[PDB]
């Protein structure tokens, strides 16, 4: 049906600058408007403006004025957004979204967003160590174990257990960032204290950022 | 430019019950106001445009409402999957603005947390420093306290802990305070102990370890 890819996650480094894509499907690229909105972690949803790919007629949030310029290209039914001169301001996740048209509008869809960091910083992929199950017989009934994620850069990352497999129980922690300057989470789940060492667990940790993909797994004492 | 007011922030409901949150334009828009609702970790999503007009797809417990500079948002029998953020946007004039959200928060029975204690993997150590991880599992309220005890040392400083939003199984938190020191200073130590106190507990449990 219709629908909306975003670009993969972005890091530059401030002064530099980006552009995020929006693919359009589904629908005619040209009759509907593109809606853009910036969402920073303590300032909930910023509307950017809006492109009419077909008469690339275009409204800025004068906020934004200058900061990003939008574009589209009618044969690849994809729209851009580009944010200029970047500083940490401007680290946000991005959502484009198709608004109305002239015949028609019954509601919006909104691109999946794109994470946008601004740092001088490396990427550093994640370091991945296990939440080692205590034997936890100790008056309860269950045991937990997990997945200790550390030292990783920027923040896009994510985790599963025996792949999606078992999704029973699992625990993720929005990241923490550390005073290296350096995000780390943990990944946890509880399984029967029983079935332990009759089947194990193991952690999917990927981050794109740089590409790394981890696959350890998880044993008692 | 026109300011859209959502008050309050967090509103708290139970399953089953019916809430309703609001949207104070600062001008008549004229029932131009549209409602998403935005799940932690996802994207915003559309529930109502033009003010009433529910977006197709979407369940009838949903409703709005509103005229002039008042308009409001009505789930007539809250289940765990409408938790998240509402935001109202106005495209009366532009720029088109955003309220500031209204975020749904369910209230449920008292819950006790399930405390684990991780100790410093053998992998992990072989490097830097050491990480000691304490997990208190789904628990409810929120409000929880976790001290870190080393030789009945009460540590200070070197915690940092994160929270999960309420689970969709049971609408529980689950909390993770984690440790962190030197190779050195650890071994330096023998007991490091995980003190939780919450409203759910009758007195304070504790979880610890030697090595
Ligand atoms: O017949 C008549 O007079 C009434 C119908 C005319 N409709 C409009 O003028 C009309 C004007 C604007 C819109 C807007 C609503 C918000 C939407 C949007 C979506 C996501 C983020 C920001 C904004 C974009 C859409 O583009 C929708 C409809």
């Known amino acids: 049906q219709v629908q909306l890819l975003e670009s993969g996650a972005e890091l530059m480094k401030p002064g530099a600058s980006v552009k995020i894509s929006c693919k359009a499907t589904?629908?005619?690229?040209?009759?509907?408007?593109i809606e853009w909105v910036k969402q920073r972690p303590g300032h909930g949803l910023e509307w950017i403006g809006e492109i009419l790919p077909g008469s690339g007629g275009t409204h800025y949030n004068e906020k934004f004025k200058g900061k990003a310029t939008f574009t589209a290209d009618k044969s690849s039914n994809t729209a851009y957004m580009q944010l200029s001169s970047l500083t940490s301001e401007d680290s946000a996740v991005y959502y484009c979204?198709?608004?109305?048209?002239?015949?028609?509008?019954?509601?919006?869809?909104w691109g999946q967003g794109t994470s946008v960091t601004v740092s001088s910083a490396s990427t550093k992929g994640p370091s991945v160590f296990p939440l080692a199950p205590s034997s936890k017989s100790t008056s309860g009934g269950t045991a937990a174990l997990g997945c200790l994620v550390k030292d990783y850069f920027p923040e896009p990352v994510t985790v599963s257990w025996n792949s999606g497999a078992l999704t029973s129980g699992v625990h993720t922690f929005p990241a923490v960032l550390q005073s290296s300057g350096l995000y780390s989470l943990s990944s946890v789940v509880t399984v029967p204290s029983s079935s332990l060492g009759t089947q194990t667990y193991i952690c999917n940790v990927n981050h794109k950022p740089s590409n790394t993909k981890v696959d350890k797994k998880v044993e008692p004492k | 430019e026109l300011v859209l007011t959502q008050s309050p922030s967090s509103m708290y409901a139970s399953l089953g019950e019916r809430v309703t949150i609001t949207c104070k334009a600062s001008q008549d828009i004229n029932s131009y106001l549209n409602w998403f609702q935005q799940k932690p970790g996802k994207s915003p999503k559309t529930l109502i445009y033009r003010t009433n007009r529910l977006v197709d797809g979407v369940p009838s417990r949903f409703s709005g409402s509103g005229s002039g500079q008042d308009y409001s948002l009505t789930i007539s029998s809250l289940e765990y999957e409408d938790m998240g953020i509402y935001y109202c946007?106005?495209?009366?004039?532009?720029?088109?603005?955003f309220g500031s959200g209204t975020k749904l928060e369910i209230k449920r029975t008292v819950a006790a947390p399930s405390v684990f204690i991780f100790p410093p993997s053998d992998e992990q150590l072989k490097s830097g420093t050491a990480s000691v991880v304490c997990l208190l599992n789904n628990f409810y309220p929120r409000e929880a306290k976790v001290q870190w005890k080393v030789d009945n040392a009460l540590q200070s400083g070197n915690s940092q802990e994160s929270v999960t939003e309420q689970d969709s199984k049971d609408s529980t938190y689950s909390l993770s305070s984690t440790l962190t020191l030197s190779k050195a200073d650890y071994e330096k130590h023998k007991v490091y102990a995980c003190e939780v106190t919450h409203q759910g507990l009758s007195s304070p449990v504790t979880k610890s370890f030697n090595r």
């Open positions: 979204a198709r608004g109305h048209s002239y015949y028609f509008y019954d509601g919006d869809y």
């Open positions: 589904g629908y005619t690229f040209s009759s509907f408007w």
């Open positions: 946007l106005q495209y009366d004039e532009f720029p088109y603005t």
